[PDB]
């Protein structure tokens, strides 16, 4: 077992051992600085929504218990009223948060477009001799979209998970530090898989953007010189060229999607295996008498929740880094 | 037993099993109390190897307001205490009842499904 542990740790560290992505993300943060008030408001509304959603379940359970057992109309009405009140507040806060995030994304996109265009206007003429207009327009209209395409969802998910993980870890430490230390088995595999997938994903995203630029250049040349293509009866030729470019783009898209699906399958299998391992260890401890049934169930709930939160954090952070770094040009 | 409104209740049968002496057995049918109506008679004696006997008291209640009435046979025998030993039954006369809301909606679903199949 010692040999196996050493070998597995060595393999994981080989897989585990980025600066360009970090600097590009810092540049994106610098560009997003003017939207600080909107982000402050969004964070405030997110916190309020989480706080209200922590209160709704108590009254939902009260309603269920009243229905199942003795029905007291006054208690039923009070529980319904409080459930509705907290749901209303949480929904209001969630809507405000989503609107703020969406508007921040739109402002960042427009700022990116303006800065890229104003920078292009300053270049020397050799830069425009060595580049193509259709490809520049493809960058300005698609890579800018990629750079800000995830804030509303990814930011929300990341912030929720960050808010919750600390408390869940505290709870599961309160129940059983031994099983809490055991539960860290998943992190190495999670991080290694994320690293491999993120490398592949960023590469394929860059290739996709290049192919999109080539197809855009095909369209640019065909439409700009329409009277010359039509005076040689060469529209079908242009359509064939565009279809070839679109085929290349389609194959790149398929590679991206297939790799992402395989990664999701792999991480689902990892999750199932680690949960089985944790359940087996907890059952052994409970049989030995170390902890009771209720403690085991509570710890399993908390540890599975933190596992899900950590996997989501890792995946979303890697996804944001890939999307930002695919727009390197 | 579950009777129906206006239908003859089934002939109840009380079994007295493995008692000695054969004589002195009093089997009385009661409606719970008042005396249970219905033609009541007795069967012959069935002897066993150990010498005890068994009897069967048969009651035919009349056609059958009540919802949970009980028909019981009480056995008084010298070997038993003064109270005897009793065996009772439950009667249900809810043989008719209007359709429930669940039944109506289920009929609606069945109609919708069978029309969809056609």
């Amino acid at each position: 077992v010692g040999y196996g542990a050493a070998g597995l740790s060595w393999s994981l560290w080989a897989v585990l051992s980025q600066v360009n992505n970090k600097v590009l993300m810092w540049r994106l943060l610098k560009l997003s600085r003017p939207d600080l008030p909107l982000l402050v408001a969004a964070f405030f509304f997110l916190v309020l929504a989480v706080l209200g959603e922590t209160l709704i379940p108590h009254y939902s359970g009260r309603v269920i218990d009243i229905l199942g057992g003795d029905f007291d109309p006054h208690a039923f009405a009070s529980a319904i009223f409080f459930m509705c009140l907290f749901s209303f507040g949480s929904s209001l806060s969630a809507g405000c948060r989503g609107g703020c995030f969406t508007y921040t994304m739109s402002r960042i996109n427009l700022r990116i477009r303006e800065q890229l265009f104003s920078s292009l206007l300053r270049q020397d003429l050799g830069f425009f001799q060595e580049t193509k207009t259709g490809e520049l327009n493809s960058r300005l209209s698609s890579d800018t979209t990629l750079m800000s395409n995830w804030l509303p969802l990814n930011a929300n998910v990341l912030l929720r998970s960050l808010v919750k993980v600390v408390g869940l870890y505290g709870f599961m430490l309160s129940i059983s530090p031994r099983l809490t230390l055991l539960s860290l088995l998943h992190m190495p595999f999670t991080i290694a898989a994320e690293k491999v997938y993120n490398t592949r994903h960023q590469e394929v995203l860059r290739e996709i953007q290049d192919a999109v630029a080539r197809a855009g250049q095909v369209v640019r040349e065909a439409v700009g010189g329409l009277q010359t293509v039509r005076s040689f009866g060469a529209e079908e030729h242009e359509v064939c060229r565009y279809k070839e470019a679109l085929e290349q783009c389609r194959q790149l898209y398929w590679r991206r999607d297939l790799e992402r699906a395989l990664y999701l399958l792999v991480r689902r299998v990892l999750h199932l295996g680690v949960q089985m391992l944790m359940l087996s260890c907890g059952l052994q401890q409970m049989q030995d008498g170390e902890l009771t049934q209720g403690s085991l169930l509570s710890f399993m709930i908390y540890q599975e929740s933190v596992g899900s939160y950590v996997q989501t954090l890792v995946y979303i952070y890697g996804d944001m880094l890939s999307n930002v770094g695919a727009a390197e040009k | 037993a579950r009777a129906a409104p206006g239908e003859a209740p089934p002939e109840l049968l009380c079994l007295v099993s493995h008692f000695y002496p054969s004589g002195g057995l009093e089997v009385e049918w009661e409606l719970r109390s008042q005396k249970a109506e219905g033609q009541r008679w007795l069967s012959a004696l069935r002897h066993h190897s150990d010498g005890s006997v068994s009897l069967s008291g048969h009651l035919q209640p009349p056609p059958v307001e009540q919802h949970g009435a009980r028909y019981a046979c009480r056995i008084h025998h010298p070997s038993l205490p003064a109270s005897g030993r009793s065996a009772e039954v439950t009667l249900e006369v809810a043989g008719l009842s209007g359709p429930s809301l669940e039944d109506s909606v289920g009929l609606f679903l069945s109609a919708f499904l069978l029309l969809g199949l056609f």
């Binding site: 508007y103 402002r107 427009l110 169930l297 | 359709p99 909606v105 069945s110 069978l114 029309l115």
Partner: protein
């Protein structure tokens, strides 16, 4: 004409209420032994259906003889056959289903006590009231927008989206097979000394989860490949349609504008299509499973829940046009920005030889300002629509809870079934919320695809190419 048809219908109703109500149960009780009450109910239902169908056929034949009056009466009479079928076969079908569900817990009161329900005037009225709306819905369905144009792109890909749906259904079945074979968690994990139950249940659950994961993997692969094909085909078609136009179409529509429509509008349309279609199909299947469970719980409350969904979908139908117009304006502003950028970046020697980089930047900034003013409205609408969806589903849940409380107080519904129904109805309402959130996205997709579909459907104002290719000219 109409008077004769109405008289025939009234006579049929009276005959059903008088003779078929009482005579048939007696005849089929005398003919059939008491050991098969379900058989008696089925025979009575079949006889009633046959009698009503023969009467309807006779009425139709009589009405066809005269054609002087309107055809509306014949249209109404067309529903006599399905109504008669419902009347006849509502009870026996329910009895058969209940018998097949469980062989040790009969619901009874329908299969047994056959004449006590066939002749029961209350049950007769209930059967008529249940058969009328089902027959009306079936007849209305049998007698038989830009979203249709949007969805027409998925025409040749039906044979693959069907595989996707099949795999989604299989994954759902595998997901639901876990509680039905292993029960609740505490039933086996908490039991001390579990050797033939902990391992068995754990292995079965793991196998089912792995199978569901692999099925989802295959379905997602099929779906993504299909969506990539759709995207490529649509872009090619749009480009070809643009190139098939006339020479002045390119003097009204400028190069950057057409390029933005061809390359960017189609891409956004396809991305929205893929995301929302996958989401919609998955949540549709899971909502159908939840509806099955709810029906098992309480049929009445499930019907009450299904009645009120159009009330929740009212407002989106009103605001869809606003969404479409907003997105059309957004696409147009993006196209204008693309035109500015393309024109500036293609004549850089001329821009620099006059020191007019600042002016080009200002034009681009003006277009971006238009887009920004539109994005503000986009965000506000997003917030308000989220509020509306949340409030709608909350009110749905609250109303169902109140009605369930009334029913449990009245004794119509048992507490356990009510709790089960509520717990699954909450998930059903969450799925309904997801679909409600999908709807504005479809409206925005219509708005985005408006101009490219205008290109596709446009008729070039130039003569078509001929067929003459003489060997010597």
């Amino acid at each position: 004409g109409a008077s004769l048809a109405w008289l025939g219908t009234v006579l049929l109703l009276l005959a059903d209420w008088v003779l078929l109500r009482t005579a048939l149960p007696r005849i089929f009780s005398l003919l059939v032994p008491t050991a098969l009450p379900l058989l008696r109910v089925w025979a009575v239902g079949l006889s009633r259906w046959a009698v009503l169908w023969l009467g309807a056929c006779g009425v139709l034949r009589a009405t066809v003889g005269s054609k002087s009056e309107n055809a509306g009466a014949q249209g109404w009479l067309a529903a006599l056959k399905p109504l008669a079928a419902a009347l006849g076969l509502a009870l026996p079908g329910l009895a058969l289903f209940r018998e097949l569900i469980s062989w040790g817990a009969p619901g009874s009161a329908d299969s047994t006590r056959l004449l006590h329900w066939g002749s029961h005037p209350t049950a007769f009225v209930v059967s008529y009231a249940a058969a009328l709306p089902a027959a009306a819905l079936w007849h209305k369905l049998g007698s038989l927008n830009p979203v249709r144009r949007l969805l027409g792109c998925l025409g040749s890909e039906t044979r693959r989206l069907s595989l996707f749906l099949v795999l989604v259904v299989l994954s759902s079945l595998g997901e639901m097979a876990i509680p039905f074979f292993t029960g609740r968690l505490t039933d086996w994990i908490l039991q001390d000394g579990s050797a033939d139950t902990f391992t068995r249940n754990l292995t079965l659950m793991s196998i089912l989860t792995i199978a569901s994961a692999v099925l989802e993997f295959v379905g997602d692969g099929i779906y993504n490949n299909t969506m990539g094909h759709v995207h490529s085909h649509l872009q090619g078609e749009v480009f070809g349609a643009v190139l098939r136009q006339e020479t002045e179409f390119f003097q009204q529509n400028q190069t950057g504008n057409i390029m933005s429509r061809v390359t960017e509008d189609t891409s956004t349309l396809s991305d929205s299509l893929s995301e929302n279609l996958s989401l919609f199909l998955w949540y549709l299947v899971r909502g159908l499973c939840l509806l099955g469970i709810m029906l098992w719980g309480s049929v009445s409350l499930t019907m009450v829940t299904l009645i009120t969904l159009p009330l929740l979908f009212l407002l989106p139908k009103k605001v869809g046009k606003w969404y479409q117009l907003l997105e059309v304006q957004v696409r147009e502003s993006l196209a204008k920005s693309s035109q500015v950028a393309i024109e500036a970046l293609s004549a850089m020697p001329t821009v620099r030889s006059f020191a007019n980089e600042e002016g080009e930047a200002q034009k681009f900034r003006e277009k971006l300002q238009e887009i920004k003013t539109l994005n503000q409205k986009e965000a506000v609408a997003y917030a308000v629509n989220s509020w509306t969806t949340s409030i709608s589903c909350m009110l749905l849940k609250v109303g169902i809870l109140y009605i369930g409380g009334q029913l449990v107080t009245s004794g119509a519904v048992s507490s356990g079934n009510l709790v089960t129904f509520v717990l699954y109805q909450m998930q059903f309402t969450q799925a309904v919320e997801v679909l409600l959130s999908i709807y504005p996205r479809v409206q925005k997709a219509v708005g985005s695809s408006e101009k490219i579909f205008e290109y596709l459907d446009r008729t070039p104002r130039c003569p078509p190419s001929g067929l003459l290719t003489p060997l010597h000219l």
